């Protein structure tokens, strides 16, 4: 019964499908994105990426 604005669902479904494949919201989806190592070491794995 609750309601979330639409802006916030469009934005999540846009980041998930923005690079042409399905980017999961796990460590295998967002760490394979090329964001730069100091940002990936903060989510998970923390040294494997460094």
């Amino acid at each position: 019964g609750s309601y979330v604005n639409y802006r916030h669902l469009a934005l999540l479904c846009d980041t998930m499908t923005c690079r042409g494949h399905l980017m999961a919201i796990t460590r295998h989806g967002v760490n394979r994105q090329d964001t730069g190592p100091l940002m990936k070491c903060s989510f998970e794995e923390t040294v494997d990426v460094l």
């Binding site: 609750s2 309601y3 979330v4 604005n5 802006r7 916030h8």
Partner: protein, 50 residues
């Protein structure tokens, strides 16, 4: 009923002014998540106003 809240104190004029212009409590009444107030009248006062 035993809840505890923390209290941070901004330590500069430039952080004080920023909190005062961006996070003060009457500025936060309407949420952008569902575009409705987050604060309402809710106990004893709501029963007595009815």
């Amino acid at each position: 009923d035993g809840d505890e809240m923390n209290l941070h104190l901004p330590q500069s004029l430039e952080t004080r002014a920023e909190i005062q212009e961006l996070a003060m409590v009457p500025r936060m009444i309407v949420t952008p998540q569902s575009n409705r107030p987050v604060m309402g009248i809710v106990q004893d006062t709501l029963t007595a106003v009815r």
